[PDB]
Amino acid sequence: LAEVDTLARSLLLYRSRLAEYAHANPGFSGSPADSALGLPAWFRKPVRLQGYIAAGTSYAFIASPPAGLAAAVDTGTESDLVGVRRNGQLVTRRLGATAIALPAPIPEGAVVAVKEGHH
Amino acid sequence: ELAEVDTLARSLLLYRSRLAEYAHANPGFSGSPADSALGLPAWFRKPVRLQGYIAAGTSYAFIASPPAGLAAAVDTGTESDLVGVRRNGQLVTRRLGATAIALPAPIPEGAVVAVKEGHH
Ligand code: NI
Ligand code: NI
């Protein structure tokens, strides 16, 4: 039924070389070009799959996105954050307070890095 | 003049990843494994208060009451990675709610978005 999966992978594939481009283009903010990016050659980027480096920080997006894709993308990525317990919410600079389920043992005020894992 | 809580932040990140991956290679678990599992390096002498947990197959590593410059130093060595739909002024990710961001202008409403902080 659902192989918006290959479309999810294309966006993440695309977000990766976007990030690697930033690493060597400091102080930039763009849509780099598809030449300059280094993408497979055999990979043909669905116009509608866009990108932007801003201050530094890759954003890859799909503006009129097929239902199923939100899910397909979230699932092929992990997610990785840093902050401090306050209170029950994760407090992270540059990102405001995020409310994750903070397991029982992390004290208020601790420093905390989080990471998820696919399927 | 200078602290290398940066060594400590690095040890945290390093411990974290040993949980990340054991967490996978051992599905259905809720921490809080002892470091004999994990398979940590010979040389590494974990300093409690470096604590770790798992909840869902997601893991956390945490210093229970922090030293100073440690959040920063750690946020730095990480990067950061979210995905979610743009509801406007916001990035809605259905496990961490709506996370409010500096979201570029050209990314318009309702767009699905993968975000990979460039740690600089
Ligand atoms: Ni670097
Ligand atoms: Ni897997």
PDB file of C-alpha atoms and ligand atoms in Angstrom:
ATOM      1  CA  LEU A   1       0.000   0.000   0.000  1.00  0.00           C
ATOM      2  CA  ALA A   2       2.267   2.642   1.421  1.00  0.00           C
ATOM      3  CA  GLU A   3       5.546   3.416  -0.131  1.00  0.00           C
ATOM      4  CA  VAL A   4       5.709   7.046   0.576  1.00  0.00           C
ATOM      5  CA  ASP A   5       8.600   5.343   2.355  1.00  0.00           C
ATOM      6  CA  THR A   6      10.826   5.780  -0.724  1.00  0.00           C
ATOM      7  CA  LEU A   7       9.701   9.416  -0.584  1.00  0.00           C
ATOM      8  CA  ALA A   8      10.636   9.690   3.081  1.00  0.00           C
ATOM      9  CA  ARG A   9      14.071   8.205   2.407  1.00  0.00           C
ATOM     10  CA  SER A  10      14.611  10.702  -0.472  1.00  0.00           C
ATOM     11  CA  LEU A  11      13.888  13.622   1.853  1.00  0.00           C
ATOM     12  CA  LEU A  12      16.383  12.172   4.502  1.00  0.00           C
ATOM     13  CA  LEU A  13      18.890  11.250   1.880  1.00  0.00           C
ATOM     14  CA  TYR A  14      18.370  14.871   0.754  1.00  0.00           C
ATOM     15  CA  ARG A  15      18.637  16.332   4.265  1.00  0.00           C
ATOM     16  CA  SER A  16      21.976  14.468   4.814  1.00  0.00           C
ATOM     17  CA  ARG A  17      23.957  16.092   1.852  1.00  0.00           C
ATOM     18  CA  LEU A  18      22.339  19.371   2.770  1.00  0.00           C
ATOM     19  CA  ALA A  19      23.922  19.042   6.247  1.00  0.00           C
ATOM     20  CA  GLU A  20      27.248  17.914   4.806  1.00  0.00           C
ATOM     21  CA  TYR A  21      27.189  21.080   2.623  1.00  0.00           C
ATOM     22  CA  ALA A  22      26.751  23.414   5.572  1.00  0.00           C
ATOM     23  CA  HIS A  23      29.829  21.723   7.303  1.00  0.00           C
ATOM     24  CA  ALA A  24      31.920  23.355   4.489  1.00  0.00           C
ATOM     25  CA  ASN A  25      29.763  26.438   3.868  1.00  0.00           C
ATOM     26  CA  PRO A  26      29.827  28.282   7.103  1.00  0.00           C
ATOM     27  CA  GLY A  27      27.867  31.612   7.265  1.00  0.00           C
ATOM     28  CA  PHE A  28      25.482  30.699   4.420  1.00  0.00           C
ATOM     29  CA  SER A  29      21.696  30.304   3.957  1.00  0.00           C
ATOM     30  CA  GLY A  30      20.376  28.896   0.660  1.00  0.00           C
ATOM     31  CA  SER A  31      19.035  26.108  -1.536  1.00  0.00           C
ATOM     32  CA  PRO A  32      22.700  25.294  -2.475  1.00  0.00           C
ATOM     33  CA  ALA A  33      21.840  23.933  -6.059  1.00  0.00           C
ATOM     34  CA  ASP A  34      21.698  20.240  -6.862  1.00  0.00           C
ATOM     35  CA  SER A  35      25.120  20.463  -8.416  1.00  0.00           C
ATOM     36  CA  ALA A  36      27.374  21.523  -5.452  1.00  0.00           C
ATOM     37  CA  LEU A  37      25.317  19.087  -3.237  1.00  0.00           C
ATOM     38  CA  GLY A  38      26.960  15.797  -4.373  1.00  0.00           C
ATOM     39  CA  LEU A  39      23.743  13.793  -4.676  1.00  0.00           C
ATOM     40  CA  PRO A  40      24.008  10.213  -6.285  1.00  0.00           C
ATOM     41  CA  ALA A  41      23.545  11.204  -9.920  1.00  0.00           C
ATOM     42  CA  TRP A  42      21.035   8.355 -10.409  1.00  0.00           C
ATOM     43  CA  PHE A  43      18.770  10.187  -7.882  1.00  0.00           C
ATOM     44  CA  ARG A  44      16.312  12.510  -9.442  1.00  0.00           C
ATOM     45  CA  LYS A  45      15.028  15.061  -6.863  1.00  0.00           C
ATOM     46  CA  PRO A  46      11.242  15.451  -6.947  1.00  0.00           C
ATOM     47  CA  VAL A  47      10.859  19.185  -7.417  1.00  0.00           C
ATOM     48  CA  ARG A  48       8.616  19.778  -4.281  1.00  0.00           C
ATOM     49  CA  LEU A  49      11.437  18.418  -2.160  1.00  0.00           C
ATOM     50  CA  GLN A  50      13.156  21.612  -1.102  1.00  0.00           C
ATOM     51  CA  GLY A  51      15.980  22.697   1.131  1.00  0.00           C
ATOM     52  CA  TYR A  52      17.344  25.585   3.144  1.00  0.00           C
ATOM     53  CA  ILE A  53      20.412  26.241   5.240  1.00  0.00           C
ATOM     54  CA  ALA A  54      19.641  29.086   7.667  1.00  0.00           C
ATOM     55  CA  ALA A  55      22.356  30.453   9.958  1.00  0.00           C
ATOM     56  CA  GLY A  56      23.362  26.770   9.723  1.00  0.00           C
ATOM     57  CA  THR A  57      20.781  24.077  10.312  1.00  0.00           C
ATOM     58  CA  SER A  58      19.364  22.020   7.475  1.00  0.00           C
ATOM     59  CA  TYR A  59      15.688  22.026   6.792  1.00  0.00           C
ATOM     60  CA  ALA A  60      14.396  19.662   4.132  1.00  0.00           C
ATOM     61  CA  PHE A  61      10.729  19.933   3.251  1.00  0.00           C
ATOM     62  CA  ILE A  62       7.720  18.991   1.279  1.00  0.00           C
ATOM     63  CA  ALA A  63       5.101  21.744   1.046  1.00  0.00           C
ATOM     64  CA  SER A  64       1.953  19.879  -0.131  1.00  0.00           C
ATOM     65  CA  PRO A  65       2.874  16.704   1.493  1.00  0.00           C
ATOM     66  CA  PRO A  66       1.012  13.414   0.747  1.00  0.00           C
ATOM     67  CA  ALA A  67      -0.667  12.033   3.815  1.00  0.00           C
ATOM     68  CA  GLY A  68       1.451   9.108   5.166  1.00  0.00           C
ATOM     69  CA  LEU A  69       4.684  11.127   4.783  1.00  0.00           C
ATOM     70  CA  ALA A  70       4.707  12.814   8.285  1.00  0.00           C
ATOM     71  CA  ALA A  71       4.689   9.298   9.657  1.00  0.00           C
ATOM     72  CA  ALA A  72       7.094   7.863   7.095  1.00  0.00           C
ATOM     73  CA  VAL A  73       9.667  10.519   7.896  1.00  0.00           C
ATOM     74  CA  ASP A  74       9.370  10.584  11.621  1.00  0.00           C
ATOM     75  CA  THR A  75       9.824   6.794  11.625  1.00  0.00           C
ATOM     76  CA  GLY A  76      13.019   6.718   9.438  1.00  0.00           C
ATOM     77  CA  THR A  77      14.649   9.329  11.708  1.00  0.00           C
ATOM     78  CA  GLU A  78      15.597   9.189  15.282  1.00  0.00           C
ATOM     79  CA  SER A  79      15.480  12.580  17.052  1.00  0.00           C
ATOM     80  CA  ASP A  80      18.108  13.877  19.372  1.00  0.00           C
ATOM     81  CA  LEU A  81      17.900  16.644  21.862  1.00  0.00           C
ATOM     82  CA  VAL A  82      19.733  18.246  24.728  1.00  0.00           C
ATOM     83  CA  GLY A  83      18.599  20.256  27.767  1.00  0.00           C
ATOM     84  CA  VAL A  84      17.755  20.371  31.525  1.00  0.00           C
ATOM     85  CA  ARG A  85      14.837  18.974  33.522  1.00  0.00           C
ATOM     86  CA  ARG A  86      12.484  21.940  34.388  1.00  0.00           C
ATOM     87  CA  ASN A  87       9.958  20.944  35.165  1.00  0.00           C
ATOM     88  CA  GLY A  88       8.881  17.650  33.666  1.00  0.00           C
ATOM     89  CA  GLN A  89       9.643  19.540  30.423  1.00  0.00           C
ATOM     90  CA  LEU A  90      12.990  19.625  28.657  1.00  0.00           C
ATOM     91  CA  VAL A  91      14.502  23.067  28.581  1.00  0.00           C
ATOM     92  CA  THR A  92      16.757  23.580  25.665  1.00  0.00           C
ATOM     93  CA  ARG A  93      18.427  26.663  24.335  1.00  0.00           C
ATOM     94  CA  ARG A  94      17.760  27.801  20.736  1.00  0.00           C
ATOM     95  CA  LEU A  95      14.651  25.546  20.893  1.00  0.00           C
ATOM     96  CA  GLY A  96      12.458  26.675  23.834  1.00  0.00           C
ATOM     97  CA  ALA A  97      10.924  24.203  26.339  1.00  0.00           C
ATOM     98  CA  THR A  98       9.881  20.816  24.832  1.00  0.00           C
ATOM     99  CA  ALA A  99       7.422  18.488  26.778  1.00  0.00           C
ATOM    100  CA  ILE A 100       8.779  14.917  26.483  1.00  0.00           C
ATOM    101  CA  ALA A 101       7.723  12.180  28.930  1.00  0.00           C
ATOM    102  CA  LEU A 102      10.671  12.499  31.294  1.00  0.00           C
ATOM    103  CA  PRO A 103      11.071   9.025  32.934  1.00  0.00           C
ATOM    104  CA  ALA A 104      10.761   8.835  36.743  1.00  0.00           C
ATOM    105  CA  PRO A 105      14.581   8.946  37.680  1.00  0.00           C
ATOM    106  CA  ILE A 106      15.808  12.111  36.036  1.00  0.00           C
ATOM    107  CA  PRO A 107      15.903  14.727  38.691  1.00  0.00           C
ATOM    108  CA  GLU A 108      14.717  18.249  38.118  1.00  0.00           C
ATOM    109  CA  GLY A 109      17.752  20.284  37.149  1.00  0.00           C
ATOM    110  CA  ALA A 110      19.793  17.352  35.743  1.00  0.00           C
ATOM    111  CA  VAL A 111      21.542  17.748  32.339  1.00  0.00           C
ATOM    112  CA  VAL A 112      19.956  15.334  29.740  1.00  0.00           C
ATOM    113  CA  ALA A 113      20.617  14.217  26.241  1.00  0.00           C
ATOM    114  CA  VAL A 114      17.937  12.129  24.531  1.00  0.00           C
ATOM    115  CA  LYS A 115      17.987   9.734  21.510  1.00  0.00           C
ATOM    116  CA  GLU A 116      15.232   7.621  19.880  1.00  0.00           C
ATOM    117  CA  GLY A 117      15.475   4.505  17.519  1.00  0.00           C
ATOM    118  CA  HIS A 118      13.521   3.943  14.106  1.00  0.00           C
ATOM    119  CA  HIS A 119      11.525   0.691  13.227  1.00  0.00           C
TER     120      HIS A 119
ATOM    121  CA  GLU B   1      40.363  30.504  32.921  1.00  0.00           C
ATOM    122  CA  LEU B   2      38.984  27.418  31.211  1.00  0.00           C
ATOM    123  CA  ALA B   3      37.011  24.284  32.037  1.00  0.00           C
ATOM    124  CA  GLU B   4      37.015  21.080  30.220  1.00  0.00           C
ATOM    125  CA  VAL B   5      33.579  19.980  31.365  1.00  0.00           C
ATOM    126  CA  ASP B   6      33.977  19.453  27.660  1.00  0.00           C
ATOM    127  CA  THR B   7      35.645  16.144  28.499  1.00  0.00           C
ATOM    128  CA  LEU B   8      32.724  15.409  30.713  1.00  0.00           C
ATOM    129  CA  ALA B   9      30.173  16.357  27.975  1.00  0.00           C
ATOM    130  CA  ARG B  10      32.060  14.123  25.552  1.00  0.00           C
ATOM    131  CA  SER B  11      31.894  11.176  28.101  1.00  0.00           C
ATOM    132  CA  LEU B  12      28.193  11.772  28.461  1.00  0.00           C
ATOM    133  CA  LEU B  13      27.767  11.672  24.618  1.00  0.00           C
ATOM    134  CA  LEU B  14      29.856   8.618  24.446  1.00  0.00           C
ATOM    135  CA  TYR B  15      27.824   6.803  27.198  1.00  0.00           C
ATOM    136  CA  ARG B  16      24.637   7.910  25.557  1.00  0.00           C
ATOM    137  CA  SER B  17      25.547   6.150  22.351  1.00  0.00           C
ATOM    138  CA  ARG B  18      26.220   2.864  24.178  1.00  0.00           C
ATOM    139  CA  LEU B  19      22.665   3.060  25.441  1.00  0.00           C
ATOM    140  CA  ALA B  20      21.317   4.148  21.996  1.00  0.00           C
ATOM    141  CA  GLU B  21      22.591   1.006  20.465  1.00  0.00           C
ATOM    142  CA  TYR B  22      22.122  -1.551  23.112  1.00  0.00           C
ATOM    143  CA  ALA B  23      18.565  -0.148  23.314  1.00  0.00           C
ATOM    144  CA  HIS B  24      18.064  -1.319  19.713  1.00  0.00           C
ATOM    145  CA  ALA B  25      20.037  -4.643  20.145  1.00  0.00           C
ATOM    146  CA  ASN B  26      17.669  -5.464  23.041  1.00  0.00           C
ATOM    147  CA  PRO B  27      14.115  -4.305  22.239  1.00  0.00           C
ATOM    148  CA  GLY B  28      11.636  -4.038  25.120  1.00  0.00           C
ATOM    149  CA  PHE B  29      13.649  -2.687  28.037  1.00  0.00           C
ATOM    150  CA  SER B  30      13.509   0.084  30.601  1.00  0.00           C
ATOM    151  CA  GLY B  31      17.075   0.771  31.606  1.00  0.00           C
ATOM    152  CA  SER B  32      18.955   1.209  33.583  1.00  0.00           C
ATOM    153  CA  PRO B  33      21.661  -1.146  32.452  1.00  0.00           C
ATOM    154  CA  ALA B  34      25.021  -1.473  34.286  1.00  0.00           C
ATOM    155  CA  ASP B  35      28.042  -0.481  32.259  1.00  0.00           C
ATOM    156  CA  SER B  36      29.290  -4.142  31.954  1.00  0.00           C
ATOM    157  CA  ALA B  37      26.570  -4.475  29.440  1.00  0.00           C
ATOM    158  CA  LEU B  38      26.858  -1.334  27.279  1.00  0.00           C
ATOM    159  CA  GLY B  39      30.371  -2.703  26.386  1.00  0.00           C
ATOM    160  CA  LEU B  40      32.116   0.492  27.269  1.00  0.00           C
ATOM    161  CA  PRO B  41      35.825   1.051  26.523  1.00  0.00           C
ATOM    162  CA  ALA B  42      38.508  -0.503  28.687  1.00  0.00           C
ATOM    163  CA  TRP B  43      39.958   2.860  29.680  1.00  0.00           C
ATOM    164  CA  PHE B  44      36.595   4.526  30.400  1.00  0.00           C
ATOM    165  CA  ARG B  45      35.894   4.803  34.138  1.00  0.00           C
ATOM    166  CA  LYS B  46      32.330   6.156  34.112  1.00  0.00           C
ATOM    167  CA  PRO B  47      31.886   8.887  36.704  1.00  0.00           C
ATOM    168  CA  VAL B  48      28.663   8.544  38.441  1.00  0.00           C
ATOM    169  CA  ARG B  49      26.710  10.846  38.372  1.00  0.00           C
ATOM    170  CA  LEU B  50      26.628   9.828  34.601  1.00  0.00           C
ATOM    171  CA  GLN B  51      23.382   8.030  34.613  1.00  0.00           C
ATOM    172  CA  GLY B  52      21.425   6.580  31.795  1.00  0.00           C
ATOM    173  CA  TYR B  53      17.843   5.226  31.349  1.00  0.00           C
ATOM    174  CA  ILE B  54      15.678   3.860  28.583  1.00  0.00           C
ATOM    175  CA  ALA B  55      12.005   4.417  28.208  1.00  0.00           C
ATOM    176  CA  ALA B  56      10.263   3.278  25.040  1.00  0.00           C
ATOM    177  CA  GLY B  57      13.247   2.116  22.877  1.00  0.00           C
ATOM    178  CA  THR B  58      14.557   5.705  23.296  1.00  0.00           C
ATOM    179  CA  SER B  59      17.386   6.384  25.721  1.00  0.00           C
ATOM    180  CA  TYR B  60      18.592   9.193  27.960  1.00  0.00           C
ATOM    181  CA  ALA B  61      21.962   9.879  29.572  1.00  0.00           C
ATOM    182  CA  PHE B  62      22.004  12.401  32.431  1.00  0.00           C
ATOM    183  CA  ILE B  63      24.101  14.132  35.014  1.00  0.00           C
ATOM    184  CA  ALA B  64      21.719  14.372  37.950  1.00  0.00           C
ATOM    185  CA  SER B  65      23.030  17.708  39.267  1.00  0.00           C
ATOM    186  CA  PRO B  66      25.147  19.558  36.791  1.00  0.00           C
ATOM    187  CA  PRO B  67      28.511  21.388  36.854  1.00  0.00           C
ATOM    188  CA  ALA B  68      28.617  24.683  35.070  1.00  0.00           C
ATOM    189  CA  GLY B  69      28.975  25.156  31.284  1.00  0.00           C
ATOM    190  CA  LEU B  70      27.853  21.499  30.820  1.00  0.00           C
ATOM    191  CA  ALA B  71      24.497  21.993  29.068  1.00  0.00           C
ATOM    192  CA  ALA B  72      26.071  24.306  26.595  1.00  0.00           C
ATOM    193  CA  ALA B  73      29.196  22.190  26.069  1.00  0.00           C
ATOM    194  CA  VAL B  74      26.915  19.151  25.434  1.00  0.00           C
ATOM    195  CA  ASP B  75      24.342  20.859  23.194  1.00  0.00           C
ATOM    196  CA  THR B  76      27.332  21.817  21.128  1.00  0.00           C
ATOM    197  CA  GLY B  77      28.760  18.327  20.635  1.00  0.00           C
ATOM    198  CA  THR B  78      25.383  16.892  19.607  1.00  0.00           C
ATOM    199  CA  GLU B  79      23.720  18.557  16.583  1.00  0.00           C
ATOM    200  CA  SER B  80      20.002  17.802  16.980  1.00  0.00           C
ATOM    201  CA  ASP B  81      17.325  16.276  14.851  1.00  0.00           C
ATOM    202  CA  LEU B  82      13.595  16.687  14.618  1.00  0.00           C
ATOM    203  CA  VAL B  83      10.904  16.163  12.075  1.00  0.00           C
ATOM    204  CA  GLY B  84       7.318  17.360  12.072  1.00  0.00           C
ATOM    205  CA  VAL B  85       4.633  19.378  10.241  1.00  0.00           C
ATOM    206  CA  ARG B  86       4.661  23.180  10.170  1.00  0.00           C
ATOM    207  CA  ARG B  87       1.747  24.658  12.006  1.00  0.00           C
ATOM    208  CA  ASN B  88       2.467  28.165  11.851  1.00  0.00           C
ATOM    209  CA  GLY B  89       5.091  29.481  14.131  1.00  0.00           C
ATOM    210  CA  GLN B  90       5.583  25.800  15.081  1.00  0.00           C
ATOM    211  CA  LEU B  91       6.920  22.281  14.297  1.00  0.00           C
ATOM    212  CA  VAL B  92       4.417  19.705  15.406  1.00  0.00           C
ATOM    213  CA  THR B  93       6.094  16.366  16.227  1.00  0.00           C
ATOM    214  CA  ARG B  94       3.733  13.673  17.607  1.00  0.00           C
ATOM    215  CA  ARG B  95       5.976  12.472  20.487  1.00  0.00           C
ATOM    216  CA  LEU B  96       7.392  15.774  21.692  1.00  0.00           C
ATOM    217  CA  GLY B  97       4.316  17.910  20.934  1.00  0.00           C
ATOM    218  CA  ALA B  98       4.643  21.261  19.149  1.00  0.00           C
ATOM    219  CA  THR B  99       8.209  22.485  19.261  1.00  0.00           C
ATOM    220  CA  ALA B 100       8.411  26.255  18.607  1.00  0.00           C
ATOM    221  CA  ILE B 101      11.169  27.285  16.137  1.00  0.00           C
ATOM    222  CA  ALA B 102      12.965  29.910  13.981  1.00  0.00           C
ATOM    223  CA  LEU B 103      11.366  28.340  10.852  1.00  0.00           C
ATOM    224  CA  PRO B 104      12.570  29.761   7.526  1.00  0.00           C
ATOM    225  CA  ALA B 105      10.135  31.980   5.594  1.00  0.00           C
ATOM    226  CA  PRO B 106      10.320  29.884   2.416  1.00  0.00           C
ATOM    227  CA  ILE B 107       9.157  26.799   4.153  1.00  0.00           C
ATOM    228  CA  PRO B 108       5.479  27.456   4.048  1.00  0.00           C
ATOM    229  CA  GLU B 109       2.483  26.236   6.004  1.00  0.00           C
ATOM    230  CA  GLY B 110       1.693  22.557   6.545  1.00  0.00           C
ATOM    231  CA  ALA B 111       5.020  21.482   5.003  1.00  0.00           C
ATOM    232  CA  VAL B 112       6.571  18.274   6.417  1.00  0.00           C
ATOM    233  CA  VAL B 113      10.102  19.111   7.572  1.00  0.00           C
ATOM    234  CA  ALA B 114      13.340  17.390   8.574  1.00  0.00           C
ATOM    235  CA  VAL B 115      15.589  19.490  10.757  1.00  0.00           C
ATOM    236  CA  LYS B 116      19.223  18.767  11.350  1.00  0.00           C
ATOM    237  CA  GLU B 117      20.916  21.368  13.448  1.00  0.00           C
ATOM    238  CA  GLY B 118      24.426  22.105  12.061  1.00  0.00           C
ATOM    239  CA  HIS B 119      25.874  22.351  15.627  1.00  0.00           C
ATOM    240  CA  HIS B 120      27.601  25.697  14.825  1.00  0.00           C
TER     241      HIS B 120
HETATM  242 NI    NI C   1      32.905  20.660  13.369  1.00  0.00          NI
HETATM  243 NI    NI C   2      16.659  -1.131  12.934  1.00  0.00          NI
END
